[PDB]
Every structure is written in structure tokens, then in C-alpha cells.
């Protein structure tokens, strides 16, 4: 089809006088709407820097990145943030919840910066927590919730502005196996409903649940593999 995200010759280095340290060394990759892709590699491989570029939280040194047709290098910080909110939701190994906000209040947060009014933010945040199986927990503080529950809150939060593309960094890394499998089934279900899910992981067993696997070694794509379930 036509791709949702397009990367061509993406490079990233951190300046150190005139020895650059090269973290990404020319990555070309296309990602489509409605698929699950895993990026797999050891620590220091560049996978996390690649994620941050996908999410528009970092800028490539060179190369081209387009999101739904729009080249990100042309945009100022306000326009980029807006683009980010139109397309992306984020989850991590840690839950990144504010301890003194309820689950619902936590979910609402990203919509604040989309200009969304409080009555409307509240409604949508409750709908998403219900979808995630937490209808009874909307007023619980994170201290009162398990790890598994906290991650479901983080997923709802990732959908608040749409979450067309979910970027997930090692989302089961801090979870027992049952909670891990719940999270993965939720991600498969979002993909079935048309979301793109991108998972970064050091673990090839987590990666094997995706439709495509990209292996990164020393800042380069070393292998690309298709899977089916």
C-alpha cells in the first residue's frame, strides 16, 4: 500500500568537537497502517534513539522522515508537537504515572495540550479506561494499583489523542508473565482495529509476536524478518 511512516537514510550522531559519535548510520524503512513491527537489538545498538526519532522527540542529523506524507524537518516545535499529538501514543517499561493524580486524571493529561476542554477530556478518559478493563478503577491513585493495572492506564493514556501509532519501549520488561501476556493481547487487539504498534525490545521472543522484525546492530539494520499468527 502507501506507507504511514517513511524513513530514508536516517543518521544520528552526537557532536563531540569534530569526532562525532555515530549512533544511527543510515536507516531506511517503511511502516504501514495497521501493522505490528518490532525493533530488536542489544543495548547500545541505537534502537532507543531510533524510537525517539520515530516519535519526533528527537531530530535526525540527516536523512528524511515523513509521517503521513509530512517531512518533519520542515516543522517548528509547535507544529511538530501538534503532528506528534495527531499521530503518536507512547508507553514504556516504567509507567510514568503521576502518583497524586487519579487513573482518569493521568489519562486526560495529553489532551490538555491539544486544547481539549475539561468535560470532554473527562468523558473520553473514562471511555478509554472502560475499554482497557478499568471502569471500576477510574478514581484510584497509582499507589493503589498493580503494575499490570498501571500499564493499562499508560495504554489508555497513549490513546487519548488517538494513538494512531503506538510506540512501545519494552512494555513487558517489568511485568510477570500473565500481566505481560495481557498487555500483548491488548496491543494485538489495537492492531486488529487498525493502529500501528511499534515495539522496541532486547528479547527476540517478544519480537516474534510482531508481523515484521527489524534487527539493529551498531546503528544499522542487519536483518528484516516476517512472521504470521
Curated annotation (Swiss-Prot):
Signal peptide: none annotated. Residues 5-223 form the ABC transporter domain. Residues 1-223 are cytoplasmic. Disulfide bonds: none annotated. The chain holds residues 1 to 223 of 648 of the full protein. It is found in: Cell inner membrane. This is Macrolide export ATP-binding/permease protein MacB. Part of the tripartite efflux system MacAB-TolC. MacB is a non-canonical ABC transporter that contains transmembrane domains (TMD), which form a pore in the inner membrane, and an ATP-binding domain (NBD), which is responsible for energy generation. When overexpressed, the system confers resistance against macrolides composed of 14- and 15-membered lactones but no or weak resistance against 16-membered ones. In addition, the system could also transport R-LPS or a similar glycolipid. It comes from the Bacteria. Homodimer. Part of the tripartite efflux system MacAB-TolC, which is composed of an inner membrane transporter, MacB, a periplasmic membrane fusion protein, MacA, and an outer membrane component, TolC. The complex forms a large protein conduit and can translocate molecules across both the inner and outer membranes. Interacts with MacA. ATP binds at residues 41-48. Changing residue 47 to L: Lack of activity. Changing residue 169 to N: Lack of activity. Belongs to the ABC transporter superfamily. Macrolide exporter (TC 3.A.1.122) family.
